[PDB]
Design a protein around this ligand. Sequence first.
Ligand SMILES: CC(=O)OC[C@H]1O[C@@H](S(=O)(=O)NCCCCCOS(N)(=O)=O)[C@H](OC(C)=O)[C@H](OC(C)=O)[C@@H]1OC(C)=O
Ligand SMILES: [Zn+2]
Length: 257
Amino acid sequence: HWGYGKHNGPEHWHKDFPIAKGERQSPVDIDTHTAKYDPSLKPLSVSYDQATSLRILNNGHSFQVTFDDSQDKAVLKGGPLDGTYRLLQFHFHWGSLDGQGSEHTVDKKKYAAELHLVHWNTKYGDVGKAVQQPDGLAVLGIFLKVGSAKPGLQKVVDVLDSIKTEGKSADFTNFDPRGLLPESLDYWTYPGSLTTPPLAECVTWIVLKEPISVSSEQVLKFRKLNFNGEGEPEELMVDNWRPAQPLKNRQIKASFK
Ligand SMILES: CC(=O)OC[C@H]1O[C@@H](S(=O)(=O)NCCCCCOS(N)(=O)=O)[C@H](OC(C)=O)[C@H](OC(C)=O)[C@@H]1OC(C)=O
Ligand SMILES: [Zn+2]
């Protein structure tokens, strides 16, 4: 089915997922001069001290680290959110070249990659129910630029050789997602959607202003993954990003001045 190639990529998705042309699709371009400071936004509360990572997995469209979300162990609160959102997984989107790869853009600037920390609203009980709700998910988005290495990313990078192809996974315990966060929690926020099918319009996006820097050797290691399963022709998992979607009847709010 859907993918990121010429014949099954983002321009094709609306045929199977008509919400792709909906009113609150993600990602978007963040026009920094049009985003309005909202002094009523609360500071984000990122509570990751008890996070329990489980597995790392190549799912054919990205690579993800999954966590135990059967208790309130790693939760996102505050900011624009009401209630408690549990961390389910994080994954990345990246490019074939350093000048592209992010899904959100900032004043039309593309970053080399973008990290998504995916959380779901505990009042809906499970993630399958949350994805059917307008406020079911909160995704924390962090941009990646190429420069110095990010030490907290290295333990991820070092196991990617063991999940090269679609359907491979590995034990990934005791990983601390706090090592992937930039210093500042200043953020932009809007109502949006999943950026992969089914593109459900269930996401409060929280996109951090400050990117993290990763090294060229770290991102090169992303680009060695494969979309295909083993035994199928090899096609490099690169450019697994959806481009910016029309903003339509939405305002992006900034938590900073
Ligand atoms: C390919 C497709 O159409 O859906 C792919 C999977 O989607 C995930 S999802 O709707 O929960 N998406 C996974 C989490 C999205 C995180 C947000 O991503 S981003 N890039 O916007 O941070 C769904 O899982 C849930 C809980 O709804 C699907 O449903 C099931 C029953 O597993 C679906 O799996 C299948 C076989 O359809
Ligand atoms: Zn994503």
